[PDB]
Design a protein around this motif. Structure first.
Motif, PDB file in Angstrom:
ATOM      1  N   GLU A   1      -5.600   1.869  -5.650  1.00 21.42           N
ATOM      2  CA  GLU A   1      -6.308   1.361  -4.491  1.00 21.42           C
ATOM      3  C   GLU A   1      -6.024  -0.114  -4.258  1.00 21.42           C
ATOM      4  O   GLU A   1      -5.932  -0.899  -5.203  1.00 21.42           O
ATOM      5  CB  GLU A   1      -7.817   1.576  -4.643  1.00 21.42           C
ATOM      6  CG  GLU A   1      -8.408   1.039  -5.935  1.00 21.42           C
ATOM      7  CD  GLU A   1      -9.879   1.407  -6.108  1.00 21.42           C
ATOM      8  OE1 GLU A   1     -10.429   1.166  -7.203  1.00 21.42           O
ATOM      9  OE2 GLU A   1     -10.486   1.935  -5.152  1.00 21.42           O
ATOM     10  N   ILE A   2      -5.868  -0.467  -2.987  1.00 22.60           N
ATOM     11  CA  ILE A   2      -5.641  -1.842  -2.574  1.00 22.60           C
ATOM     12  C   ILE A   2      -6.923  -2.248  -1.850  1.00 22.60           C
ATOM     13  O   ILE A   2      -7.342  -1.573  -0.905  1.00 22.60           O
ATOM     14  CB  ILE A   2      -4.441  -1.952  -1.607  1.00 22.60           C
ATOM     15  CG1 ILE A   2      -3.147  -1.622  -2.351  1.00 22.60           C
ATOM     16  CG2 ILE A   2      -4.380  -3.354  -0.999  1.00 22.60           C
ATOM     17  CD1 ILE A   2      -1.888  -1.970  -1.575  1.00 22.60           C
TER      18      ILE A   2
ATOM     19  N   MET B   1      -7.583   0.811   0.955  1.00 24.84           N
ATOM     20  CA  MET B   1      -6.623   1.890   1.122  1.00 24.84           C
ATOM     21  C   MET B   1      -6.569   2.598  -0.233  1.00 24.84           C
ATOM     22  O   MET B   1      -6.164   2.008  -1.237  1.00 24.84           O
ATOM     23  CB  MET B   1      -5.261   1.329   1.546  1.00 24.84           C
ATOM     24  CG  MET B   1      -5.272   0.812   2.992  1.00 24.84           C
ATOM     25  SD  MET B   1      -3.779  -0.058   3.527  1.00 24.84           S
ATOM     26  CE  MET B   1      -3.980  -1.600   2.615  1.00 24.84           C
TER      27      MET B   1
ATOM     28  N   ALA C   1       0.802  -1.213   0.000  1.00 25.37           N
ATOM     29  CA  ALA C   1       0.000   0.000   0.000  1.00 25.37           C
ATOM     30  C   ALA C   1       0.841   1.270   0.000  1.00 25.37           C
ATOM     31  O   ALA C   1       0.611   2.148  -0.824  1.00 25.37           O
ATOM     32  CB  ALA C   1      -0.954   0.004   1.198  1.00 25.37           C
TER      33      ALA C   1
END
Length: 241
Positions: A170-171, A160, A138
Motif C-alpha cells: 500500500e502507498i 492505493m 503505485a
C-alpha cells in the motif's frame, strides 16, 4: 494538408507510445484549432482522449482540415528516433501519407502511410492531484502482486491498496507528503481498478508531472495530465465491467 512543428520530439513520442499501449490505430482530427484524438480500447474498459491545441506547437499551418488515420506502432517506431531536444515536423500533402522529419544536430526523414480508421460526465465524490512519481510507484509496486489496485480517499488521505488475502502493498499519502498536492473529498470514496490498464495509462508519465485523478464509489476514474500547459491527455477507466 498541413505542416505542424513540435519542439521536443521525445515528449511527442511518449504520448504516442502511451496511446499505442491501449489501441493499435487511431484517428487524429487535425483542424486549425489543434489536434484531437479519441478512442476506446478493444476491451471497452478505457477511453483515451488527447487534445493538443495549436498554441503548444512552434509552427501550426493547416491549409485544409483533415482527419488522418495511422498505425500507432509504426508511428512510435519512427518517433523513438527523436531526442529530448529534437524538433519534430509533421507534413501532410495531397497523398495518403505523413512525412515526418526529426531534426537535432542532423536531420532524418520518414514516411508513415495513412489508414482508414472507423471507430467523462460522472458525479465524482473525490479529487486528487499527485506527482507522477506516486502513480508510477503505485503501479510498479502492484503489478504482479494483485489483479487490481484499490483507491481510497478521505478528508486528508489518499491510499492505493487492494484489501484481500495476498501479500499486501500500500502507498499512503497525506498533504504533508510531497506526492500529494491537493485533495478534495465530499465523502469517503473507494473503488478498484485493473493493474495492467493503470500501468499502460501511466506509461511515459513524468515523475514531476502533476496528475489529476477524479473518481467515485464503485465508479469509473478520470485521470488527466497536461502537455505544455494547454494540451491534455485524459483517460476514463471503468472500475469493473
Amino acid at each position: 494538408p498541413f505542416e505542424i512543428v513540435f519542439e521536443g520530439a521525445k515528449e511527442f513520442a511518449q504520448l504516442i507510445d502511451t496511446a499505442s499501449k491501449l489501441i493499435d490505430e487511431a484517428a487524429f482530427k487535425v483542424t486549425e484549432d489543434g489536434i484531437s484524438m479519441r478512442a476506446m480500447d478493444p476491451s471497452r474498459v478505457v477511453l483515451i482522449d488527447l487534445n493538443l491545441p495549436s498554441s503548444i506547437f512552434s509552427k501550426y499551418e493547416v491549409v485544409e482540415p483533415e482527419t488522418i488515420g495511422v498505425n500507432l506502432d509504426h508511428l512510435k517506431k519512427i518517433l523513438k528516433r527523436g531526442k529530448a531536444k529534437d524538433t519534430l515536423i509533421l507534413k501532410k500533402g495531397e497523398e495518403n501519407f505523413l512525412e515526418i522529419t526529426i531534426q537535432g544536430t542532423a536531420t532524418r526523414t520518414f514516411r508513415v502511410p495513412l489508414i482508414d480508421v472507423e471507430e467523462p460526465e460522472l458525479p465524482f465524490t473525490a479529487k486528487v492531484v499527485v506527482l507522477g512519481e506516486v502513480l508510477k510507484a503505485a503501479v510498479k509496486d502492484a503489478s504482479l502482486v494483485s489483479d487490481s489496485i484499490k483507491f481510497i480517499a478521505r478528508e486528508n488521505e489518499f491510499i492505493m491498496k487492494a484489501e484481500g488475502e495476498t501479500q499486501e502493498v500500500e502507498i499512503k499519502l497525506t498533504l504533508e507528503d510531497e506526492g500529494l498536492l491537493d485533495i478534495e473529498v465530499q465523502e469517503e470514496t473507494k473503488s478498484a481498478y485493473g493493474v495492467s490498464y493503470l500501468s499502460d495509462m501511466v506509461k511515459g508519465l513524468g515523475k514531476a508531472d502533476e496528475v489529476t485523478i477524479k473518481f467515485g464509489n464503485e465508479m469509473p476514474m478520470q485521470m488527466e495530465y497536461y502537455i505544455r500547459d494547454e494540451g491534455r491527455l485524459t483517460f476514463l477507466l471503468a472500475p469493473r465491467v
